[PDB]
Amino acid sequence: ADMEVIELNKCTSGQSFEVILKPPSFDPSLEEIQKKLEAAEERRKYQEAELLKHLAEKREHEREVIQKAIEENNNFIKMAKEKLAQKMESNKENREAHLAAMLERLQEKDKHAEEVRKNKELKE
Amino acid sequence: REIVHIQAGQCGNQIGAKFWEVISDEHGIDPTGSYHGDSDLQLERINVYYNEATGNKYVPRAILVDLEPGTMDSVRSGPFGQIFRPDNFVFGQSGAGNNWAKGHYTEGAELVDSVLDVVRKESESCDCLQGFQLTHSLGGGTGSGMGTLLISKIREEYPDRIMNTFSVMPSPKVSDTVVEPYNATLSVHQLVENTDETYSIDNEALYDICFRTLKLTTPTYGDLNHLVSATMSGVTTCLRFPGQLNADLRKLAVNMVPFPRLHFFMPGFAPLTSRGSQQYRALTVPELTQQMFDSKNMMAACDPRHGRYLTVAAVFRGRMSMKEVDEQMLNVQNKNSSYFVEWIPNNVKTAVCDIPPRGLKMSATFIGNSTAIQELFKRISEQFTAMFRRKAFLHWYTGEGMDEMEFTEAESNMNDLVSEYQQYQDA
Amino acid sequence: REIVHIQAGQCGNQIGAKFWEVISDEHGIDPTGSYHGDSDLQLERINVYYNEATGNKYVPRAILVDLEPGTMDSVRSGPFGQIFRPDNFVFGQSGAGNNWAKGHYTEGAELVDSVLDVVRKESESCDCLQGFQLTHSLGGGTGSGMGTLLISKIREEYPDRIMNTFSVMPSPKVSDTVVEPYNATLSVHQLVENTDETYSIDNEALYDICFRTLKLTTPTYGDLNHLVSATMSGVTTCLRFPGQLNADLRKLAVNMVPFPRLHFFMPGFAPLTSLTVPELTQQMFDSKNMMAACDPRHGRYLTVAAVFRGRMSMKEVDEQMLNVQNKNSSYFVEWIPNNVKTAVCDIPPRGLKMSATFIGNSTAIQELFKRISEQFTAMFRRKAFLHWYTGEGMDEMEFTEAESNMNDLVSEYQQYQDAT
Amino acid sequence: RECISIHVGQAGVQIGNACWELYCLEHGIQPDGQMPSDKTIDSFNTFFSETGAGKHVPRAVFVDLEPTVIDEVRTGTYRQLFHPEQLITGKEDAANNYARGHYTIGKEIIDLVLDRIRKLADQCTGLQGFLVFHSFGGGTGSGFTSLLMERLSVDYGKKSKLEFSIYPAPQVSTAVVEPYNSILTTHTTLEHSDCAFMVDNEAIYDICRRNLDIERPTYTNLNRLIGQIVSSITASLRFDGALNVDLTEFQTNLVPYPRIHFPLATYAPVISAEQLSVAEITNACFEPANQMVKCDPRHGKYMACCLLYRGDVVPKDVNAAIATIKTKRTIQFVDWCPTGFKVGINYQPPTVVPGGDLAKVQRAVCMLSNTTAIAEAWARLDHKFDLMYAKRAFVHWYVGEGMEEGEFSEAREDMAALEKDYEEVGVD
Amino acid sequence: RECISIHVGQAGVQIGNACWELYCLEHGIQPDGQMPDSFNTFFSETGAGKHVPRAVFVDLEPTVIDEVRTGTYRQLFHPEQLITGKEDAANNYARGHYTIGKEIIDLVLDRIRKLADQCTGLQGFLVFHSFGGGTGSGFTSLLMERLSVDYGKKSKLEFSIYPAPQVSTAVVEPYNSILTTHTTLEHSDCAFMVDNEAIYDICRRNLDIERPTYTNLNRLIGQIVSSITASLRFDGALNVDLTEFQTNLVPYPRIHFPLATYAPVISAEKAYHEQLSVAEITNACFEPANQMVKCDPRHGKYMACCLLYRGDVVPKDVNAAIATIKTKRTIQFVDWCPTGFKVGINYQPPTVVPGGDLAKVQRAVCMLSNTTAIAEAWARLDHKFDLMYAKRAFVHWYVGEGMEEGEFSEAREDMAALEKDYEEVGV
Numbered sequence A: 001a002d003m004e005v006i007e008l009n010k011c012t013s014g015q016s017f018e019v020i021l022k023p024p025s026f027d028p029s030l031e032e033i034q035k036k037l038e039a040a041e042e043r044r045k046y047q048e049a050e051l052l053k054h055l056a057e058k059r060e061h062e063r064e065v066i067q068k069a070i071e072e073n074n075n076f077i078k079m080a081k082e083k084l085a086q087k088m089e090s091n092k093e094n095r096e097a098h099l100a101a102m103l104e105r106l107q108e109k110d111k112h113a114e115e116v117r118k119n120k121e122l123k124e
Numbered sequence B: 001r002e003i004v005h006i007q008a009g010q011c012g013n014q015i016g017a018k019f020w021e022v023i024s025d026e027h028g029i030d031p032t033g034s035y036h037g038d039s040d041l042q043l044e045r046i047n048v049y050y051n052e053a054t055g056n057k058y059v060p061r062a063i064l065v066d067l068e069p070g071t072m073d074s075v076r077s078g079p080f081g082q083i084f085r086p087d088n089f090v091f092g093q094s095g096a097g098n099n100w101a102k103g104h105y106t107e108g109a110e111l112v113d114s115v116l117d118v119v120r121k122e123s124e125s126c127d128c129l130q131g132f133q134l135t136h137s138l139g140g141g142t143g144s145g146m147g148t149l150l151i152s153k154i155r156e157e158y159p160d161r162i163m164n165t166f167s168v169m170p171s172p173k174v175s176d177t178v179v180e181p182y183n184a185t186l187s188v189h190q191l192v193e194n195t196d197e198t199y200s201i202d203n204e205a206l207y208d209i210c211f212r213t214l215k216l217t218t219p220t221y222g223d224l225n226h227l228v229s230a231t232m233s234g235v236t237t238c239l240r241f242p243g244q245l246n247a248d249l250r251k252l253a254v255n256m257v258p259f260p261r262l263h264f265f266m267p268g269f270a271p272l273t274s275r276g277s278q279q280y281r282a283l284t285v286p287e288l289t290q291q292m293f294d295s296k297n298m299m300a301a302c303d304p305r306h307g308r309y310l311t312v313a314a315v316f317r318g319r320m321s322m323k324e325v326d327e328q329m330l331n332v333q334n335k336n337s338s339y340f341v342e343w344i345p346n347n348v349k350t351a352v353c354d355i356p357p358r359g360l361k362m363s364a365t366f367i368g369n370s371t372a373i374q375e376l377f378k379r380i381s382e383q384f385t386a387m388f389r390r391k392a393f394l395h396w397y398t399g400e401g402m403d404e405m406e407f408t409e410a411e412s413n414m415n416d417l418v419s420e421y422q423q424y425q426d427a
Numbered sequence C: 001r002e003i004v005h006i007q008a009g010q011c012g013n014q015i016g017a018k019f020w021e022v023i024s025d026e027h028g029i030d031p032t033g034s035y036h037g038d039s040d041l042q043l044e045r046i047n048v049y050y051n052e053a054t055g056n057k058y059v060p061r062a063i064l065v066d067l068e069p070g071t072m073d074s075v076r077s078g079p080f081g082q083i084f085r086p087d088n089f090v091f092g093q094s095g096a097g098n099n100w101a102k103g104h105y106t107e108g109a110e111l112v113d114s115v116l117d118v119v120r121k122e123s124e125s126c127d128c129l130q131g132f133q134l135t136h137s138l139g140g141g142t143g144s145g146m147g148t149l150l151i152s153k154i155r156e157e158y159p160d161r162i163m164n165t166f167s168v169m170p171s172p173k174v175s176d177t178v179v180e181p182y183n184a185t186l187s188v189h190q191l192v193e194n195t196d197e198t199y200s201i202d203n204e205a206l207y208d209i210c211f212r213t214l215k216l217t218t219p220t221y222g223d224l225n226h227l228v229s230a231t232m233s234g235v236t237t238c239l240r241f242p243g244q245l246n247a248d249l250r251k252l253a254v255n256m257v258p259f260p261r262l263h264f265f266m267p268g269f270a271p272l273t274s275l276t277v278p279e280l281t282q283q284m285f286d287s288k289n290m291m292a293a294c295d296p297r298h299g300r301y302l303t304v305a306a307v308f309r310g311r312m313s314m315k316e317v318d319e320q321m322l323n324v325q326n327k328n329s330s331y332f333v334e335w336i337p338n339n340v341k342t343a344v345c346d347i348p349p350r351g352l353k354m355s356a357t358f359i360g361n362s363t364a365i366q367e368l369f370k371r372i373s374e375q376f377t378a379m380f381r382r383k384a385f386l387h388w389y390t391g392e393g394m395d396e397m398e399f400t401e402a403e404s405n406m407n408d409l410v411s412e413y414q415q416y417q418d419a420t
Numbered sequence D: 001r002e003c004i005s006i007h008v009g010q011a012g013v014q015i016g017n018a019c020w021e022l023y024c025l026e027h028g029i030q031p032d033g034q035m036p037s038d039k040t041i042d043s044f045n046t047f048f049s050e051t052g053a054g055k056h057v058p059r060a061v062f063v064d065l066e067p068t069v070i071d072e073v074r075t076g077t078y079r080q081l082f083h084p085e086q087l088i089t090g091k092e093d094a095a096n097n098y099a100r101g102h103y104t105i106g107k108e109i110i111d112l113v114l115d116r117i118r119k120l121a122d123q124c125t126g127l128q129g130f131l132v133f134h135s136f137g138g139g140t141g142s143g144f145t146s147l148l149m150e151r152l153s154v155d156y157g158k159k160s161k162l163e164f165s166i167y168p169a170p171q172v173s174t175a176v177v178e179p180y181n182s183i184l185t186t187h188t189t190l191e192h193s194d195c196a197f198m199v200d201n202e203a204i205y206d207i208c209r210r211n212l213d214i215e216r217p218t219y220t221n222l223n224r225l226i227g228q229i230v231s232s233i234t235a236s237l238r239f240d241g242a243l244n245v246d247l248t249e250f251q252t253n254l255v256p257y258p259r260i261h262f263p264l265a266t267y268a269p270v271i272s273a274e275q276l277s278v279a280e281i282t283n284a285c286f287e288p289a290n291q292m293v294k295c296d297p298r299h300g301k302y303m304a305c306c307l308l309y310r311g312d313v314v315p316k317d318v319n320a321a322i323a324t325i326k327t328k329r330t331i332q333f334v335d336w337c338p339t340g341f342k343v344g345i346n347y348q349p350p351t352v353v354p355g356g357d358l359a360k361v362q363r364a365v366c367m368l369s370n371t372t373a374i375a376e377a378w379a380r381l382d383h384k385f386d387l388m389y390a391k392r393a394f395v396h397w398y399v400g401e402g403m404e405e406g407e408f409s410e411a412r413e414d415m416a417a418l419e420k421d422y423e424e425v426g427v428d
Numbered sequence E: 001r002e003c004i005s006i007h008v009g010q011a012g013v014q015i016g017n018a019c020w021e022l023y024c025l026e027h028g029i030q031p032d033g034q035m036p037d038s039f040n041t042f043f044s045e046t047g048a049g050k051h052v053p054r055a056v057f058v059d060l061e062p063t064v065i066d067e068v069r070t071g072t073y074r075q076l077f078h079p080e081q082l083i084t085g086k087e088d089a090a091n092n093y094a095r096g097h098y099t100i101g102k103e104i105i106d107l108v109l110d111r112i113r114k115l116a117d118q119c120t121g122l123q124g125f126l127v128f129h130s131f132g133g134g135t136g137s138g139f140t141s142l143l144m145e146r147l148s149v150d151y152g153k154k155s156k157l158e159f160s161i162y163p164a165p166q167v168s169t170a171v172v173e174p175y176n177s178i179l180t181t182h183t184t185l186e187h188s189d190c191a192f193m194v195d196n197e198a199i200y201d202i203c204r205r206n207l208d209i210e211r212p213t214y215t216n217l218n219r220l221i222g223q224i225v226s227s228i229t230a231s232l233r234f235d236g237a238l239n240v241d242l243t244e245f246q247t248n249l250v251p252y253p254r255i256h257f258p259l260a261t262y263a264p265v266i267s268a269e270k271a272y273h274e275q276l277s278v279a280e281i282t283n284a285c286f287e288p289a290n291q292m293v294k295c296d297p298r299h300g301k302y303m304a305c306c307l308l309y310r311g312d313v314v315p316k317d318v319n320a321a322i323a324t325i326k327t328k329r330t331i332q333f334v335d336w337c338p339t340g341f342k343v344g345i346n347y348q349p350p351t352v353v354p355g356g357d358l359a360k361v362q363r364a365v366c367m368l369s370n371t372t373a374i375a376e377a378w379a380r381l382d383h384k385f386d387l388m389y390a391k392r393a394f395v396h397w398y399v400g401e402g403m404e405e406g407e408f409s410e411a412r413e414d415m416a417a418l419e420k421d422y423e424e425v426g427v
Ligand SMILES: Nc1nc2c(ncn2[C@@H]2O[C@H](COP(=O)(O)OP(=O)(O)OP(=O)(O)O)[C@@H](O)[C@H]2O)c(=O)[nH]1
Pocket: B245, D008, D009, D010, D011, D012, D014, D015, D064, D065, D066, D093, D094, D095, D096, D135, D136, D137, D138, D139, D140, D141, D142, D166, D167, D168, D169, D172, D173, D174, D175, D178, D201, D219, D220, D222, D223
């Protein structure tokens, strides 16, 4: 171009100099905030003690399945036990009473030969 | 699983003595001793009818009851008398009277205990007592009268175990007494209450099988007893033979009797008869079925036409192609399909046993719970009402201690049994 | 930086036992002893899969879980049985039942602890525990059932560290049970909540790679496991090899899964059975060659990791890989930039001069779940075989709940065929 | 793990007697109890216990209220096989009626049996369940079996119970009351079983006639055949091999609903002494003539199907067979459950009783199918029942041993219910 | 006066590792620390034999800092000054900045302070770090805020590695970049972007390396950095201090980012070809192919230009060169500021790592220009960002380590702002 070169400082291991070429042509980060850094630590410690009290949730019901299983089993055994004893001493009390019901007509048509043989005590 | 036998009254005993001697021959037993015969099966079930005693020996489980010496010394001095235990005989001394009251109340219950004392011994010394069966006449007194007493005294002691009777229903032709109606009716009432099955052997029928089909002019109490003895053997077979499997006789009951009252079976036999008249053995299975099912061939005087079959048990005899039995039996329930009740399915069961009776290469026998039986009772209750009419011979009972209306009571009861057999020709 | 391994249930263990024997061969390990092999690299990352003990010796960081002796004595009496620590085996005695309820609740939570007790002993004696990976069947009870229980019990103890599973998803052809739908669906729900990545190994797929492309008539649980064992090796390479640099397995997660729910990867393998780079790429990317029974045509790729194998001109890999994302440019989502990363490792697997393997987070997976949820709704219909669960203590509507959940995962894989 | 057989009542006993026979041939155990093969110095161990240091004893118990039948066992070789203990007998019959068997004569012996059984449980480290063999009709088979099952249910919690019942047929029959007995037990019996294998005596009798040539087939004729079907079913878990290998698992495949127990069995090649393709035998399984309960399944629908192969088979053919069973037949699968076919192969070739009626086969099939079709036998029975009870026909024999008129009402009530349930599974 | 280097996170570390290497060669210091003020700006003469860099190295995984304390140079730093942190940052800012950062920050910040403590006029900090990648983006940010607090005036110069699709680690890279560069922004003074793609490009055209290593790239960057720090290790007019660096280059507090263009990059093996003229190298500086950030500056305008020569150069050629760079080119200077070119010569000839890839040169140039053109990379980045966040694509992983959805909004917001500022400087 043909420059004008203003020479800003000569040195030992060097040397600077501008060359303005063509006229220019116009006319607190602050502290406090690791208050931020622990509200992240806080939003973590929540969001995560949550997907944890959510797993104590998942737990308690575990117990309740294992527990409402066996719980509804002592339903079956301890009902089929007395669906027998009270349908099998309902039954034993049935025929036992019916055996007498038979031995009855037979105690009677019996005390009947007694009643008309003490009838043979009259024949003249 | 093991059964006692009571055998009471002239007829009861004359039948029993023959029955016993017939079966004793099937199993093969000496007058006294034990087995002699090339067969082996025999003694599998000899248990059931023979409580066996010291030495070899095979004494039958039999009580003989009667109300006079008479027909006991008959058996002992005759066919197989050396067999029955010397003190299984209960004597009588007095009369039978041929009078039901006598048998059932006075002269009978006089004895009664000494019979029970002996039944209690045989039974109490059973392993598992099946029950009792009894033979006896139905008309005439010691047989029917004391008999029905005995069974009434047997229930009560043993409600438990089951009641079986061979009861010979009496008839105008071949009878000794004007009173048979009374005697029969009075026991018929008793039986309907106290037994579980009764084989209705009609004395009427028996005689008919001898004149109408047998060219036998003047029939004894003998060649007549020969029929029942044969019939009895064939009826009992399953209790005392196979391993196919067993017949509880309780099982027999539960299967034959639909309704608690109606235990009245007409028996029937395959081939029949006697001495120089048996020459046949041309008996075939087809010819054997048609014959065991023919009215002309029942042991009760009633044609199983009027009246259908409730249930039927039929049991053949002798090594024969049972493949053919099945389909012949099926043919009977087709050429006669109408006369087996529609409301009890597969209600006829047939079995075969391959050891023939006395003589006879082939045989068979039939047990039928039939409402044709209705006719039998009607026909006794018809000559009965006919007498109780203007209270006929009744005074013989009246003053033996019996009640006027105890007859009407037995008349009523039986006339109902007719009513129910009739109720069951239904839909 | 160091990881434990759970290996539960008949399938889980039949796979694991093969996986272990395959990698133990890559690094070079005797049935018992230690290194024997002219290579050197091997033991750089042997740390990651092998907690090493007295003498020389190299014992793998493995827990084996099962609900009956059966298939444990299988491994111990067979290939590389002398290797696993004698008491890293947790027995069962009882049944599995081939029933999820049994595995997840009754017969399983019966055991559970003695497993955790052991995991806690391997984990607590880690230097820096990466996390856990688990292998297992998804239909059939001890594998899926106790498995899903285990992972649920592993989160909670270690939320912290990440959750990895090879989960084999059962199918009509090559299956033992009418109930597979139920067992799968029940665990699929579970997995979507509790893991961070699941490799979807479709048993259906597997079989297909044996008849359609193999001329293999009657396929064992064997020459089928051989596929998974091969697939597993190549999938894990990045954890247990280079110095280029590392794969955190956490890193794997953060980079593969854009959305918390959608951790479902279809794996794919290069050469197969019992190769050029161009021919190797076309092949590892072919639908015919996925480890999940679904054509990645219906459904685009979210993110893809692909990892080659064997001393080969990787200059050519770069530009072949770039060709796949061009002759198919449309089928890689526009809204995740440079969303497929490829790596090479120059130490070949068993046999094979060249290889490669592919991990893809693809919404084609959508099809897999649908197809299980379709034979599932078909059963839950008039409430089919359910009474086997009903009366093991389980709820009527806990099925509707798992059905609902999964049917949503289908809904979201679908939501993501979107726009820009 | 372990596996106790119970044989209650004549029919039950003889059946068992004739599969235990078959099991012994299949594992090379002489009646002597001793076997000179393999070890025990498991496999064969599910059904047998290596008691003493020479013998083998079945994990079994036999009961009958008449001695006759159990007695025969302690006469003919095999006499040596069981323990004198394990065969219980009861002095007096059941006399062909449930009421007797369930209450009157049962009551007594039930306490002993239940305990003896317990003595077998006692030497079983993981006992798995019970196989109960019994008749449908017949007194002790219906009656006692019922009592047992209730009690078993109580004394044994989880433990599955599998029943093998002999559904009765007009021809080869004992009793008239058979229907009553059947509907009676099947009602009580019902919610105590898990899965139940019906054997229609008629069909068995039919297979023997067409396929064996036996003009009029014996009881032991039939039993041999049933032995085979049973041995095919138990098979799977007597050796361990490929498919169907624990009791829950096996059956979790057959029943879909807590009722609907009853699968339908169809044994493959039944052909007489004095080979067939894998495809043929497969196909023979879909022939109602080769069926095992007199009914018609190209009629009802299928709700679960099982094919149990035994012998020389690569699944390659088994597949190729199934293919053309679907190309050429009534598919028939119900609305809301796959199109199944759980296929299990047990390589062990089928052995057959040496002086028996069936020839040694190279390969045999089994096919257990839970089809709604089997309800045909459920009605065929009730109509018999209905039309007797329509008149109290024999009721009085039950009320005799102290039963309730209302129980018949109540038990029929349930078959109405069941017959509904069953038909109530078709179509959507 | 003094001058502390920080290298945070893998990329940062290896870069440093390979310029500290170069500095040592340049000053004849052996790895043992011993050589047999001037350069005291970067080294402290600790003990009476050794040399220790005024440096600190930090990474959250040990792997990378570990390798430094294995390979010769192991002897160079103080066991203390290399901090490592047990667990990764796992490729995300949120983890680095908040979750895993937080812990180690307190140690690092202090150890750094231990270096400040032995510096009689410490001048400021040179921070080396990646743009994407977890600890480079994340921790660097936390550090800078803190550094800004503990050190008032002190300038901060950052050298960031702007990521390139090819040689890359992570998919979320864009997020991490835009994230840091937002926080990171008003805490830095002047920032030297190094577009990894360009570097990789120079290596391929200019070095012949088919697929260039990390350490392949680093050697090159070593050079550019050594060219920039040069001035203040030899002291020789033009940027003798960090103050001057912002004075001379950055005219708007925001607009930090100058664009570097290193002169002759020519491969050994070429090493004997006749050397290049003062005019050629000068001209090479205006070639976008020889650029250091993939963009196009004959497009944007120039707002400040700097030419840093190193070697055998009388200024009277440097002038004569500039003459014809204008006569024959896109001048391009922006409206309201000279037509600069502040020229510095440092006579020290450029040394190069001996078994390296570039040949020993007689004279090299550097050219730092703050051109609005560099905003091309600012967009190229945001469009990647914009088009993931458009779907929350990976956001959930950050909210995971407890960050705010709103922070992304807020950080992008600033890049919109910047991209505006930048273009809003033309005409
Ligand atoms: N398949 C078969 N069925 C039999 C056998 N024995 C009897 N039955 C049938 O079983 C039913 C009768 O059952 P049973 O065993 O005889 O009667 P139970 O009360 O159980 O045994 P018992 O004590 O003898 O009365 C009828 O349907 C007969 O057909 C047999 O050996 N095989």
